[PDB]
A = this chain, B = another copy of it.
């Protein structure tokens, strides 16, 4: 038997996994990072929008602080997030930016002077004073009043990922790529590592550790149309689920992006519409103003996606051999503007769409983009299965609730990497594990037998036909608009798909470097994940954040002010087990209310919300009258925890 030991095992080499690895390795814990691919190729590398952090450096960022970022996050989540976690996040984001700056991330900087900027409420001139010169800049992104999105020109995710990966190399972290975790090793409710398949040699290896952290990203590829890399299949999510103990949170909470290139899904940055990009239909008609007279194209991304689907359903979509889509016209911004401020988007449409944006319109359609759902953890990042931690998009630390803020996800990956990294390091250093070879052998032999059965299967089902059908079912029934009737149909078909995945037969019999065998064990995993999404969507009879039920259009703060928890305790069951974790309004710094975007009064008020709100207004007034600072007031409303190392306040320009 092959066994590899390390004090801290990290599964996933994206921003979250790599940053957590830095945290453990810097304190002497031997750590290993497992990854399907070279870590610098992780999906994190594709982020071009930016990272949200309340620095308050630039003119349009002036006055920004943790409180404002906190409120945008909570309201954006439509109150589905754990507000204490959101607080941990916003207070740490500024230090994540600054640490990365010290690590060499080339953040775009502010230069003194006037600038021709688009405010879309007063596209005037912005002035940056001399004292702001040379500091980290910020741009309009995510719809926040305060511009706090930091960026490194047009490749933020890329430069951030490379810096953290390089730090891991500096520290001697053991990076092992083309290695896939296919099962978690656990006993007595504790996680001792993972069974890993070497994608090159086919060897099955047991990686044991005092603590295991899953940072495997999102599960967007269960959909046909997604902006995600082809490796975002949620297998990390599935192995946690298959332990029968760890739970997944809000898997039905999936966010879509309105303007990905159709049908590839290659992203066309938000800056397009933010600069002046126009959405047109089959007749070249600018339709957003018809649905949103005021906001128009600049409405909340959430609203734009809905309007786009509505317009298509009204029969105004463009017919295509790949399906219906709409148009994105950016030529109207002028060739000059495009080649100087959107040189990146121009290259995309040419290299892939084969068209010059300064002349022709780009085909677009809303597609799956971010996974708010994931492995459920406490505020420390630990799952119900002791010793198993999770961070990044793969988790449901839940700072996002039912709607993640644009720019908060790459921010979370690094921030969670830092925070969960500390708690994870503490766990690995203080915990003591009992590694029984009997248990290790059972898991390793179990997976070797599984691989053998797949290779020897005489089944007649085709894995690709099954995977492709799953993706259509998800796109057709679990998209932007959902209804009970279609969701019930989806669940039934997914369950049938799952059963058939067990009768798959493959042509190539080798155990090494076999992409076909890889699909054979990944697909069944993706189906169980899809089932948690679809079933969670069917059972959640309300509309909240990105989850829209046409048959239940209102946000129900009385019956659904909670979090869906999915599990799969019995390996024989074919449907996930769903339970609910209620959100306590008493522990909320901000009581439920109007989210800011979308129709008003579209939520069923909870009497407890009103009570808490009054309680909040009272505490504020009293303390505010007593001449108390925002910090003391915050503590009085909702105290939260932070590792000692990050307890400090964030110095800002002007203190």
CB atoms of A434 and B433 under 8 A apart: no
Q: Kindly state whether residue A1 has any CB partner on chain B within 8 Å.
A: yes
- From A159-167, A397-405, A435-443, A473-481, the one touching the partner chain is A435-443
CB atoms of B432 and A433 under 8 A apart: no
What is the CA–CA distance of A441 and B433 in the complex, to the nearest angstrom? 11
Q: CB within 8 A of A30: which of B1, B432, B441?
A: B1
* Residues of chain B contacted by A137 (CB below 8 angstroms): none
Q: Write out, one digit per residue, whether chain A residues 425-459 have a CB within 8 A of any chain B CB (1) or not (0).
A: 00000001111111001000000000000000000
Q: Kindly state whether residue A3 has any CB partner on chain B within 8 Å.
A: yes
CB atoms of B438 and A436 under 8 A apart: no
- How large, as a class, is the contact surface on chain A? 10 to 19
Give A436's nearest chain B residue, CB to CB. B434
What is the CA–CA distance of A7 and B435 in the complex, to the nearest angstrom? 14
Q: Kindly state whether residue A210 has any CB partner on chain B within 8 Å.
A: yes
Q: Kindly state whether residue A131 has any CB partner on chain B within 8 Å.
A: no
Q: Kindly state whether residue A507 has any CB partner on chain B within 8 Å.
A: no
Give A432's nearest chain B residue, CB to CB. B438
Q: Kindly state whether residue A2 has any CB partner on chain B within 8 Å.
A: yes
Number of chain copies forming the complex: 2
Which of A434, A435, A436 has the largest number of chain B CB atoms within 10 A? A435
Q: Kindly state whether residue A464 has any CB partner on chain B within 8 Å.
A: no
* Residues of chain B contacted by A640 (CB below 8 angstroms): none
* Residues of chain B contacted by A5 (CB below 8 angstroms): 3-5
Give A434's nearest chain B residue, CB to CB. B436
Q: Write out, one digit per residue, whether chain A residues 546-582 have a CB within 8 A of any chain B CB (1) or not (0).
A: 0000000000000000000000000000000000000
* Residues of chain B contacted by A437 (CB below 8 angstroms): 210, 432-435
Q: Write out, one digit per residue, whether chain A residues 165-194 have a CB within 8 A of any chain B CB (1) or not (0).
A: 000000000000000000000000000000
User: Whole-angstrom distance from the CB of A321 to the nearest CB of chain B?
Assistant: 54
What is the CA–CA distance of A432 and B3 in the complex, to the nearest angstrom? 15
Interface class of chain A by DSSP: mixed
* Residues of chain B contacted by A7 (CB below 8 angstroms): 1
User: Whole-angstrom distance from the CB of A596 to the nearest CB of chain B?
Assistant: 50
Give A5's nearest chain B residue, CB to CB. B3
What is the CA–CA distance of A530 and B212 in the complex, to the nearest angstrom? 48
User: Whole-angstrom distance from the CB of A7 to the nearest CB of chain B?
Assistant: 6
User: Whole-angstrom distance from the CB of A207 to the nearest CB of chain B?
Assistant: 11
Give A209's nearest chain B residue, CB to CB. B437
* Residues of chain B contacted by A441 (CB below 8 angstroms): 432
User: Whole-angstrom distance from the CB of A170 to the nearest CB of chain B?
Assistant: 19
* Residues of chain B contacted by A4 (CB below 8 angstroms): 5
CB atoms of A435 and B434 under 8 A apart: yes
Give A210's nearest chain B residue, CB to CB. B437
User: Whole-angstrom distance from the CB of A446 to the nearest CB of chain B?
Assistant: 16
What is the CA–CA distance of A433 and B439 in the complex, to the nearest angstrom? 10
What is the CA–CA distance of A7 and B206 in the complex, to the nearest angstrom? 13
Which of A2, A433, A437 has the largest number of chain B CB atoms within 10 A? A437
What is the CA–CA distance of A432 and B187 in the complex, to the nearest angstrom? 15
Give A437's nearest chain B residue, CB to CB. B433
What is the CA–CA distance of A611 and B5 in the complex, to the nearest angstrom? 60
What is the CA–CA distance of A210 and B108 in the complex, to the nearest angstrom? 56
Which of A5, A30, A432, A436 has the largest number of chain B CB atoms within 10 A? A5
* Residues of chain B contacted by A436 (CB below 8 angstroms): 432-435
User: Whole-angstrom distance from the CB of A187 to the nearest CB of chain B?
Assistant: 11
Q: Write out, one digit per residue, whether chain A residues 1-13 have a CB within 8 A of any chain B CB (1) or not (0).
A: 1111101000000
User: Whole-angstrom distance from the CB of A192 to the nearest CB of chain B?
Assistant: 10
User: Whole-angstrom distance from the CB of A67 to the nearest CB of chain B?
Assistant: 43
What is the CA–CA distance of A7 and B2 in the complex, to the nearest angstrom? 9
* Residues of chain B contacted by A432 (CB below 8 angstroms): 436-438, 441
User: Whole-angstrom distance from the CB of A174 to the nearest CB of chain B?
Assistant: 11
User: Whole-angstrom distance from the CB of A188 to the nearest CB of chain B?
Assistant: 13
What is the CA–CA distance of A55 and B7 in the complex, to the nearest angstrom? 54
User: Whole-angstrom distance from the CB of A371 to the nearest CB of chain B?
Assistant: 34
What is the CA–CA distance of A394 and B377 in the complex, to the nearest angstrom? 54
User: Whole-angstrom distance from the CB of A1 to the nearest CB of chain B?
Assistant: 6
* Residues of chain B contacted by A434 (CB below 8 angstroms): 434-437
What is the CA–CA distance of A441 and B3 in the complex, to the nearest angstrom? 18
* Residues of chain B contacted by A2 (CB below 8 angstroms): 30
* Residues of chain B contacted by A210 (CB below 8 angstroms): 437
Give A435's nearest chain B residue, CB to CB. B435
What is the CA–CA distance of A437 and B211 in the complex, to the nearest angstrom? 12
Give A441's nearest chain B residue, CB to CB. B432
Within 8 A of B (CB), among A235-280: none
Using a CB–CB cutoff of 8 Å, the interface residues on chain A facing chain B are 1-5, 7, 30, 210, 432-438, 441
Taking A432-B441, A435-B437 as known contacts, 9 extra A-B pairs with beta carbons closer than 8 A to each other, sorted by chain A number, are A1-B30, A2-B30, A3-B5, A432-B438, A433-B436, A434-B435, A434-B437, A435-B435, A435-B436
Can you list 9 pairs linking A and B with CB atoms under 8 Å apart? A1-B30, A2-B30, A432-B436, A432-B438, A433-B436, A434-B434, A434-B437, A435-B435, A435-B437
Enumerate the 5 nearest inter-chain pairs by beta-carbon distance, A residue then B residue, closest first: A3-B5, A435-B435, A432-B438, A433-B437, A434-B436
